[PDB]
Every structure is written in structure tokens, then in C-alpha cells.
Write a protein that binds this ligand. Structure first.
Ligand SMILES: C=C1/C(=C\C=C2/CCC[C@]3(C)C(=C=CCCCC(C)(C)O)CC[C@@H]23)C[C@@H](O)C[C@@H]1O
Ligand SMILES: C=C1/C(=C\C=C2/CCC[C@]3(C)C(=C=CCCCC(C)(C)O)CC[C@@H]23)C[C@@H](O)C[C@@H]1O
Lengths: 11, 240, 240, 11
């Protein structure tokens, strides 16, 4: 669920 | 009749964020699936778009205030505006002399015929090229180019946003900076701000048409299998 | 003391199916993301595996009886055995002199160090290379190579299969053909059938180890984003 | 749900 977006959005 | 310190800091942080996420050498393009000239350009252009989405995410994370939003609003803003920021940032490689995007070499020179070989039609590509030429004719300063990308990304009128007042206040603060910059630093830019806001409206129309043609592309598994996981996630219809 | 007509037809249809899905020129490899020598080889090897999965599917669709199975059993057999057939079919490019896979050029010559740069470790690559060398030493006829891939694919002891008796009967018919071929057409292959069945057991061990290391790769989104949709679908844990 | 597999498995 928006897995790649969550990873890219964090530090 | 002059910008404040807090406003020039916004300009500085935005310009640096763009210099960190846009490489003028285009040396990373060799890592994409090579261009082929059915839908022979889809693999290369899918890698190009996917790579550009990562850059837009990196640019967004350095906009003042965007990182303080909830993770859901950040995703909603990115999913709805990703294709628009890509069309905006691609003007840097668009050339009026060639009417195409030149990214350092004939293999990385993309014309209208190259995008048709990626599943798209002229009802999207004609306004797209007609969008790039007048945006190029505006001859924006780099400060104005990056402000317009930031304003486009922080738009409140996008599906899925929850904190309408928090993001609208951010976008309003960026618009005042843009108006003030053009006023003070751009001679003859008296009609420029209105022309820049109009380009945002054109982007909404380009966004709607791309989503229609992407949906037809993504409903055929033989074509959607050529896309990347990031493209499928960002352009997908999943809602948080 | 000789094969029947129905059995030699099985051999013919299997050899033709392999010639239609395995191109000895390797000219399609130029369309993959180029090899780079963290995890710099993952993009190229992910495209290599994804491309090979499409070939294994095409090979499977031409095996007698496989296409008459339900769509669910076909998927269950493909999902569990895809990586094994790929390891099996890759022996055609494996070379004992180089201890590597040579696919026409130095850029497409894959050694053990190249696969470590795709997220895998020696606890999978040591048995893998130790699997390729003894399979190469068996010096299988092409008729035996393709029969072994068919037998491996039509294994009943795989998760998700529903028609255990229908697929076991297919695999038994292919095994009798293989035994009879080696008996009649392969001099000195007296101990060969047992050695070929043992390689199936080794493939199960290689399959288990690859799934463990793939799971760690697929749980990190920065790595799973470099995979292809077909790889994610075939190696994924979705059950029908 | 096995979307790419279903497409590739049919004629
Ligand atoms: C990206 C960037 C560039 C080009 C963008 C283009 C030209 C090719 C066609 C593109 C990529 C577009 C389109 C539609 C085709 C791809 C969409 C698909 C098929 C995935 O749905 C809109 C923007 C257009 C190159 C460079 O400016 C970086 C920028 O960042
Ligand atoms: C494929 C084929 C070939 C090579 C296979 C190899 C060598 C490289 C490493 C490979 C691809 C393996 C592995 C693991 C790494 C990739 C798995 C990952 C990272 C996606 O999980 C098992 C089989 C090995 C080339 C040719 O023989 C066609 C065949 O069809």
C-alpha cells in the first residue's frame, strides 16, 4: 500500500 | 518593493532542491532500457518517467513545509501532480529549434513520434507540445521555474487531500514570493504572473488526458508489464 | 526396445517448443537494462529473469496436456517451478571452461560475483554453480534436456495444485519416455536416469534457498522497485 | 490477481 512511496518519502 | 529575508530563503532552498534533483548531464539515461524506433518506445519512456518520479519526490521533500505534512497528504499531492511536475521540469530539455526534448545525444532526443510509440496519441501530444513551446517562450528565470513547480505541487484542489487549509497557506506563501520576484527582479514581467497561473490550468487538462490514455495502457497486461513498479504505484488508482 | 509413435511425437513437440522459446543468438539481451559491475547488477538480472519467465511460459503452453489443465493449476505449476526451469535452461549457456554463463559478449558473461551484486549470497550461488557443473558433465542430449524441463514443470508435489492425479499421470508419461530414450538412444546412459532425477531434488533445494533470499530482497522497497511486474507476480506470495 | 500470467497463458 504505497510501499515504494512511503520508503522514498522517509529519511 | 523588495523581497524579505524569509522569502529569499524560500527561493534559495527551492533552487538548491532543483539543482540536487536535476542533472544536466543526463548520464543516468544510459541505465534505462534502450529506446527502440508494437509500442517499442514504452520500455525506455517508462524508465524515463519512473526515474523522473524519483526526482520529483526528492524535490518535494526539500520544499519548505511539505515534509511537515502528514504522510497521506504528501502521497495525495505526489500522485495527482507527478505527471504535471514532470511536464513542467521537462521544459528544461525542450528546444524550440527542434520541437523536441534533447537530453544529450540522438538516442535521447524524443520527438512526438517517439511518444506515439509508447501508447499515446496526438490528442495528448499536440497540447503537450503546444504547452512546452509557450512555456519556453515565457523565458522563465530559474527562480520562477522552480517556484512554479512548487506551487503546482502544493495545490489544494487535488483528490485525496485532507488538510486543505494547511496546504493552501503554503501555496499562497509561494505565490506571494513569485509575484514579488517577478515584480522586482523581472523587467517587463508585468503580465507574466497571469501567464504562469494559466499554465497551471493547462497542466490540469494535460493531466486529465494522460490519465485517460494511461488507463487504457494499464488495462492491457502485455503493456502494463513493461511499466515499472513505481510508475504503477504512483499512477495507480489505489487510495489511502 | 524402441520408442512408440506417440512417444516420439512427445519428444518432437518438446524439442520444437524449446527451439521456439530459446534463441541462441541472445540478441534480445541488448533490450535489458545494461549490466553494471549497491546491487548494481539487480536491474539487468531482473530483466534477464523476467524475460526468461516469459520463455518458460511459452515452453509450458506447448507441452502436451499442460494447456488442458485448469488455469489455476497452470499458474501454481509455473509459480513454484519458474526459477527451477530457468536454472535448468541456463545450463545451455553455462561453460565449464569459464565457470560462468556466456551469452554472446563480455557484457553478457555472468559470473558468481555478478549475481552477488544482485542481492544474493554464496549459500545460494555455491550450490547453483555446483548444480550447473554436474548437470553439464551429464552431457544430456537435447531430447533429454527438454524432457527434464517438462518433467520438472509437471511435478505434482508443488504448492497450490488441485488435480494431483491428472498432472501426475502426465509426469509419469514423460518419465517413461525419458527412461526409454536413454535406454535405446543413449549409449552408456545406464546410470543417467537416476542422476537426472537427483538433479530434480537439487532443484528443490536451490528453489527453497532462492525464495528465502528473494523474500529479503522483496521486503526492501528500494530493491523491489528495481524488479519487473512479471517477476513480482510470479515470485510473489499471492495464492489463487 | 495473476493478471500478467492469465494474459500470457491464453491465446
Ligand atoms: C521527464 C523528463 C524529460 C522528458 C519528458 C518528456 C518527453 C518524452 C515524453 C514525456 C515523458 C511525457 C509523456 C508521456 C509518455 C510517458 C507516460 C506513460 C507512457 C508512462 O504513461 C510527458 C513529459 C515528456 C527529460 C528531461 O527534461 C527530464 C524530465 O524529467
Ligand atoms: C536465465 C537464463 C540465463 C542465465 C541464468 C543465470 C545466470 C545469472 C544468474 C541466474 C539468473 C539466477 C539467479 C538468481 C539471480 C536473479 C534472481 C532475482 C534477483 C530476480 O531474485 C539463476 C539462473 C542464473 C542465460 C541463458 O541461459 C537463458 C536462461 O534463461
Amino acid at each position: 500500500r504505497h510501499k515504494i512511496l512511503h520508503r522514498l518519502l522517509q529519511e | 518593493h523588495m523581497l524579505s529575508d524569509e522569502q529569499m530563503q524560500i527561493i534559495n532552498s527551492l533552487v538548491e532542491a532543483h539543482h540536487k534533483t536535476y542533472d544536466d548531464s543526463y548520464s543516468d539515461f544510459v541505465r534505462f532500457r534502450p529506446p527502440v524506433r508494437r509500442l517499442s518506445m514504452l520500455p525506455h519512456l517508462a524508465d524515463l518517467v519512473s526515474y523522473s518520479i524519483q526526482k520529483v519526490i526528492g524535490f518535494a521533500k526539500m520544499i519548505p513545509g511539505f515534509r511537515d505534512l502528514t504522510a497521506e497528504d504528501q502521497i495525495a499531492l505526489l500522485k495527482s501532480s507527478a505527471i504535471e511536475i514532470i511536464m513542467l521540469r521537462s521544459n528544461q530539455s525542450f528546444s524550440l529549434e527542434d520541437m523536441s526534448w534533447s537530453c544529450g545525444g540522438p538516442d535521447f532526443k524524443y520527438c512526438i513520434n517517439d511518444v506515439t510509440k509508447a501508447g499515446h496519441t496526438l490528442e495528448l501530444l499536440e497540447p503537450l507540445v503546444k504547452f512546452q513551446v509557450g512555456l519556453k517562450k515565457l523565458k522563465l528565470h530559474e527562480e520562477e521555474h522552480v517556484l512554479l513547480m512548487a506551487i503546482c505541487l502544493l495545490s489544494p484542489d487535488r483528490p485525496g487531500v485532507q488538510d486543505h487549509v494547511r496546504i493552501e497557506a503554503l501555496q499562497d506563501r509561494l505565490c506571494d514570493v513569485l509575484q514579488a520576484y517577478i515584480r522586482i527582479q523581472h523587467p517587463g514581467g508585468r503580465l507574466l504572473y497571469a501567464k504562469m497561473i494559466q499554465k497551471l490550468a493547462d497542466l490540469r487538462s494535460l493531466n486529465e488526458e494522460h490519465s485517460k490514455q494511461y488507463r487504457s495502457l494499464s488495462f492491457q497486461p502485455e503493456h502494463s508489464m513493461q511499466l515499472t513498479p513505481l510508475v504503477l504505484e504512483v499512477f495507480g488508482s489505489e487510495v489511502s
